[PDB]
Structure 1
Amino acid sequence: MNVDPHFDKFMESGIRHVYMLFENKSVESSEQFYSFMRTTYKNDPCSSDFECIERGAEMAQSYARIMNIKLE
Structure 2
Amino acid sequence: MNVDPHFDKFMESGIRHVYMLFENKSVESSEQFYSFMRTTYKNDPCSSDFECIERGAEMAQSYARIMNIKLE
Normalised-by-shorter TM-score class: over 0.9
1:13-34 deviations in whole A, cap 9, x for unaligned? 0000000000000000000000
- CA distance, structure 2, for counterparts of residue 64 and residue 38 of structure 1: 15
1:8 maps to 8
* RMSD (Å) for aligned C-alpha atoms: 0.3
Q: Normalising to structure 1: TM-score of the pair?
A: 0.99
TM-score of the pair, normalised by structure 2? 0.99
How many residues are paired up? 72
Q: Which runs of 4+ in 1 moved over 6 A?
A: none
Structure 2, unaligned stretches of length 5 or more? none
Unpaired runs of 5+ residues, structure 1, are none
CA-to-aligned-CA distance 1:25-51 (integer Å, 9 cap, x gap): 000000000000001000000011110
